[PDB]
């Protein structure tokens, strides 16, 4: 159950979250702060793509007789130019923004992984599949303190060192 | 005791196009293209438009006897023909 | 927004129903699909 392996489907509370395993209990959880930042950011981006557009009262359809052929050709040319520029700009813009959205989400995952790794530098063995297996045994307050960001090294340092010596 | 890092996934099969990729399956997306039409002519800026039934602009403004009843309208946003 | 084929809502910035538009209308495009992703990559577990 790691991020390199795939994506979880049980949790829907946030885009980003932790899975905790304990003797007392086992379940999923979600990082409200990280997800809230990201949801706000994506909302702002979508609003800017749709809102910055401001339409005015324009008439597109024009009528010209047989004598005014140059005017009809000019109107066709300017309409074709506008639609071609709009198509090219919109398609390249949406492709680039999709790539930014995926890149930003991956960067959020890597930032969360590096944060929890910097907090658990050597107290927990790293599986490499996205799982941090604790050497030291600690209950649910320990894991939610890891979620809280208030985990401390010296409290479980000696037990972790003994568990390294055992393995 | 293990702490795992993962991301949310669901049953949605929406396809998005990404530069450097194609047909990427994603959990949610928004559509900027409105290909739908009501299929009925409607008021524009809250003004009922003028209706021309089997009539032209010339027959409406010159006073064709078949087109006489359509002159009684006072305001219009656009003209259907 | 109003087109001869039918009425179009004016919320979204782009449309492809008809090139000839009357009033405050989204800009006409020839693109068949215009979707922006707001989520992550969907992969089964």
């Amino acid at each position, epitope marked *: 159950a790691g991020f390199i392996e795939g994506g979880w489907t*049980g*949790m829907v*509370d946030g885009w980003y979250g932790y899975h905790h395993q304990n003797e007392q209990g086992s379940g999923y959880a979600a990082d409200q702060k990280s997800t*809230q930042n990201a949801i706000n950011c994506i909302t702002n981006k979508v609003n800017s793509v749709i809102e910055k557009m401001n339409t005015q009262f324009t008439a597109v359809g024009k009528e010209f007789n047989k004598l005014e052929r140059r005017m009809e050709n000019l109107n066709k040319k300017v309409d074709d130019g506008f639609i071609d520029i709009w198509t090219y700009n919109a398609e390249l813009l949406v492709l680039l923004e999709n790539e930014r959205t995926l890149d930003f989400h991956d960067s959020n995952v890597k930032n969360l992984y590096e944060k929890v790794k910097s907090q658990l530098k050597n107290n927990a063995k790293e599986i490499g599949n996205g799982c941090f297996e604790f050497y030291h045994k600690c209950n649910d307050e320990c894991m939610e303190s890891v979620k809280n960001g208030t985990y401390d090294y010296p409290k479980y340092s000696e037990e972790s060192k003994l568990n390294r010596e055992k393995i | 005791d293990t702490i795992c890092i993962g991301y949310h996934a669901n049953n949605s099969t929406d396809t998005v196009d990404t530069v450097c990729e194609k047909n990427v399956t994603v959990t949610h997306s928004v559509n900027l293209l409105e290909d739908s039409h009501n299929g009925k002519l409607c008021l524009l800026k809250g003004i009922a438009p003028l209706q021309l039934g089997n009539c032209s602009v010339a027959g409406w403004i010159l006073g064709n006897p078949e087109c006489e009843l359509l002159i009684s309208r006072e305001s219009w946003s656009y003209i259907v023909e | 927004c109003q087109t001869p084929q039918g009425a179009i809502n004016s919320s979204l910035p782009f449309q492809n129903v008809h090139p000839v538009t009357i009033g405050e209308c989204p800009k006409y495009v020839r693109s068949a699909k215009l979707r922006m992703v707001t989520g992550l990559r969907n992969i089964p577990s």
Partner: antibody
Amino acid sequence: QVQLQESGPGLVKPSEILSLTCAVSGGSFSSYCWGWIRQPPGKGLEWIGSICGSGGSNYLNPSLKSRVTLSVDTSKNQFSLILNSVTAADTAVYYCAREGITIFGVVIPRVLDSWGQGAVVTVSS
Amino acid sequence: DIQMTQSPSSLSASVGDTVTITCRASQSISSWLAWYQQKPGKAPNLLIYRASTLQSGVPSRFSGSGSGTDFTLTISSLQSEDFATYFCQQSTSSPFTFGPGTKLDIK
């Protein structure tokens, strides 16, 4: 629109198991979290705890963490509250509600829309 | 954790008036807020989510805005059904505490 119906004992002695069962009609335990809200008489609302999915995500209040345990069973289609060591301060009108609102495919946390009509319970002699 | 305050505590207004209720938060909660109105003895209902948007099935007379530590809810025309109490809720972290409540009354 989902319909929420809750059943309660209506009376509870001090210091035993207090259990209420909330049933939902027209909805399932899929992609929507479910939570419990209680109000004391004449005081403001507060959040006891929330379950989401089918037993996957469990959230509890820090003050009531040891006291409340949330259990679900989709086959019978109810979610229930289990409370031990009940006190006189627990006299409240229990509300069960659905976390039905969502933005961009996420279920906003703890923003409730449709609740139940309420089941009153008092702790007394 | 994130302490919630409301102002004014009690307000009275007639039918058709404009009333602004300002719930205030101890620490920045960004744009995340829930507004609930509670009829006496009935289930509270959702009014405003994200402090700027309207939940469907709610009349459009209600409007909310604000950012930072200060937020406002503005009602244009206040009818008889809108005289119930109102609540302010934050949604960024546990515990998800609620506002003390603001009561509305005729004159």
